Amino acid sequence: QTGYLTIGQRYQAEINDLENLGEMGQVWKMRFRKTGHVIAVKQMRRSGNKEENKRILMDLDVVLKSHDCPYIVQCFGTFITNTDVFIAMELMGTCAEKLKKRMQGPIPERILGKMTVAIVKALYYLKEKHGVIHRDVKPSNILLDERGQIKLCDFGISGRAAYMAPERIDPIRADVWSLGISLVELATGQFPYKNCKTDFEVLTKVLQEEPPLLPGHMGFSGDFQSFVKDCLTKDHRKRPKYNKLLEHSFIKRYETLEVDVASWFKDVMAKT
Numbered sequence: 001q002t003g004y005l006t007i008g009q010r011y012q013a014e015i016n017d018l019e020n021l022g023e024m025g026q027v028w029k030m031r032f033r034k035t036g037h038v039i040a041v042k043q044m045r046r047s048g049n050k051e052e053n054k055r056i057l058m059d060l061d062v063v064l065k066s067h068d069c070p071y072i073v074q075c076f077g078t079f080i081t082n083t084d085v086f087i088a089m090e091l092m093g094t095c096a097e098k099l100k101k102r103m104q105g106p107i108p109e110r111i112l113g114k115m116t117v118a119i120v121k122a123l124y125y126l127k128e129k130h131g132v133i134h135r136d137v138k139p140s141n142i143l144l145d146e147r148g149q150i151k152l153c154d155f156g157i158s159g160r161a162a163y164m165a166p167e168r169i170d171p172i173r174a175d176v177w178s179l180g181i182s183l184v185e186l187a188t189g190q191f192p193y194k195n196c197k198t199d200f201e202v203l204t205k206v207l208q209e210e211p212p213l214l215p216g217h218m219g220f221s222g223d224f225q226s227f228v229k230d231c232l233t234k235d236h237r238k239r240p241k242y243n244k245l246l247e248h249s250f251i252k253r254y255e256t257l258e259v260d261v262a263s264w265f266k267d268v269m270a271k272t
């Protein structure tokens, strides 16, 4: 499973069959010299940090297991040298965190609806088919592309950080609270805990204050405010499992609705 790159068509290639087009944001944007396809390649050096390499290997482990989930970044191949490990992956556009900064404002609900559906099914696929919890859902971990695809990416600390659930600071569905905070941030353009100066102060506001719900004067649908209210339940026992979440009216609306995510993505990317 090393030395092959499958971008249907499988190619027996190596590392220098790729052209380095620069670093993204270590993830390289590389071009396959044989055909011309552009892919994303992460480089893990053997002399790198021991903790970082362990987190990279755990992320690739989950990615290789989830080759059938359409809401997870697919890996095309792997190259192992005497000094490095190159992980070829699907080239996405950018993360929702960078989409918010370029929008310089709120992200429309119809875009977040398709985003919500993709993230819950990815988190539900991880707990069902692999017993995986993500434990780090945030806008920087939500990748978009030019074709309108929405996928979850980082599984470096997945199990078998200001988005922490109340049950995770004072002890399942902890990833649901992180999704709710991410939705409020992307829907309002403001992080609900931006005034905090330390990590601990964020944790005290989570347990002492009411859940940061969506405003009511921005035209948000009733189903959108209901879904965020359910995700931001402070007691994890009343927070619904993924089985009940996938039956929410906000989920069912955007499972069927056709939303032009691709053109909205290209329109935002064109702006400066």
Ligand SMILES: *CCC(=O)N1CCC[C@@H](n2nc(-c3ccc(O)cc3)c3c(N)ncnc32)C1
Pocket: 024, 025, 027, 040, 042, 059, 060, 063, 073, 089, 090, 091, 092, 093, 094, 095, 096, 097, 098, 139, 140, 141, 153, 154
């Ligand atoms: C929020 C986006 C961002 O700034 N970054 C950091 C720089 C790399 C960006 N990026 N990461 C991945 C990636 C890496 C590893 C796995 O397992 C999945 C995804 C990207 C991919 N695949 N394509 C484009 N950009 C990526 C994220």
